C-alpha cells in the first residue's frame, strides 16, 4: 500500500497472509474454513496465516493453518487477468473471535463513489522498494467505469473495477494482491493489478466480487 496508514493490530480481522516460506499475497476469510484470494496468487504449498499484524514477529493472536484444496476460477485468463479469483479451503476450521473474523459477501454490487478500505503488506513505495512488516490500510473510492476504461483502454472487463485516485500518490501495490477491498462492511473487491503503483492516471484494478457470489456459494457447498 502506497500512501496509506498503519491499520493497527487486528483492526482488519478478515485479512489473511498467504505464506509459502514468506508472505506472497493477501486474502480474505469468508467463513471459518474458506479464504478468497486472486487466481494469480496460485501456488502449491500454501499456509494461511490469520490474526497477523507484524508478519515477522509472533505476537499472540495468530492462527497458522495449511490449505487442503485450492480452486482457481474456471475461466481465469492469466494474460488479461479476467476472472482473477481463487478459493482456498483450510485443513481445519479457524477459531473465530473479535480479532479473527469473516467478512460478508455482498448481496449487491457497489456503485462508483462508494468509499472502501484496502489493506495489505505490499510495497509502500511507487519508486523503489520498502516492504512493511505491519498491516497498512488505505481508504479509497470506487471510480466510474468510464474513468477506469479511459485510464486502461482495451483492458477493463465487466469483472473489474478501478478504485483510488487519478492524481496518484495512494494505491495498492506489489504484495497486496489477493487482499480485500471492503465497502460498507462487505467484500466488494480483490486486489488484482495495475500499471505500477500510485502513478497519475493509473489507479488500481480490482476483481469485482459481486459477479462471483453464486460461484463462491456453490463451490463451498460441494467441496
Ligand atoms: Ca505475527
Curated annotation (Swiss-Prot):
Active site residues per record: 40, 84, 177
Q: Where is the Peptidase S1 domain?
A: 1-221
Cofactors required? Ca(2+)
> Where, in this chain's numbering, is Ca(2+) bound?
52, 54, 57, 62
Q: What is its main location?
A: secreted
Q: What is its EC number?
A: 3.4.21.4
Q: How is the cofactor bound?
A: Binds 1 Ca(2+) ion per subunit.
Q: Which CDD domains match?
A: Tryp_SPc
Q: Can you say what this protein is called? A: Serine protease 1
The disulfide bridges present are 7-137, 25-41, 109-210, 116-183, 148-162, 173-197
Q: Where in the cell is it found?
A: Secreted, Extracellular space
One GO biological process this protein is involved in is:
proteolysis
Q: Which InterPro entries match?
A: Peptidase_S1_PA, Peptidase_S1_PA_chymotrypsin, Peptidase_S1A, Serine_Proteases_S1, Trypsin_dom, TRYPSIN_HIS, TRYPSIN_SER
Catalytic reactions on record = Preferential cleavage: Arg-|-Xaa, Lys-|-Xaa
Print the organism lineage.
Answer: Eukaryota, Metazoa, Chordata, Craniata, Vertebrata
Q: Which gene encodes it?
A: PRSS1
Q: Name one GO molecular function term.
A: serpin family protein binding
| Binding residues for substrate | 171-172, 174-175, 177
Amino acid at each position: 500500500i502506497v500512501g496509506g496508514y498503519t491499520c493497527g493490530a487486528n483492526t482488519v480481522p478478515y485479512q489473511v497472509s498467504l505464506n509459502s516460506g514468506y508472505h506472497f499475497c493477501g486474502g480474505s476469510l469468508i467463513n471459518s474454513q474458506w479464504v478468497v484470494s486472486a487466481a494469480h496468487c496460485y501456488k502449491s504449498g500454501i499456509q494461511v496465516r490469520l490474526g497477523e499484524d507484524n508478519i515477522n514477529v509472533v505476537e499472540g493472536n495468530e492462527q497458522f493453518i495449511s490449505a487442503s484444496k485450492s480452486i482457481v476460477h474456471p475461466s481465469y485468463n492469466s494474460n488479461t487477468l479476467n476472472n482473477d479469483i481463487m478459493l482456498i479451503k483450510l485443513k481445519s476450521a479457524a477459531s473465530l473471535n473479535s480479532r479473527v473474523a469473516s467478512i460478508s459477501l455482498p448481496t449487491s454490487c457497489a456503485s462508483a463513489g462508494t468509499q472502501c478500505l484496502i489493506s495489505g503488506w505490499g510495497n509502500t513505495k511507487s519508486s523503489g522498494t520498502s516492504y512493511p512488516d505491519v498491516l497498512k490500510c488505505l481508504k479509497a473510492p470506487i471510480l466510474s467505469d468510464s474513468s477506469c476504461k479511459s485510464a486502461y483502454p482495451g483492458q477493463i472487463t465487466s469483472n473489474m473495477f478501478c478504485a483510488g485516485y487519478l492524481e496518484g500518490g495512494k494505491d495498492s501495490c506489489q504484495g497486496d494482491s489477493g487482499g480485500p477491498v471492503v465497502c460498507s462492511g462487505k467484500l466488494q473487491g480483490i486486489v488484482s493489478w495495475g500499471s505500477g503503483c500510485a502513478q497519475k492516471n493509473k489507479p488500481g484494478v480490482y476483481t469485482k466480487v459481486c459477479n462471483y457470489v453464486s460461484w463462491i456459494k456453490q463451490t463451498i457447498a460441494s467441496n
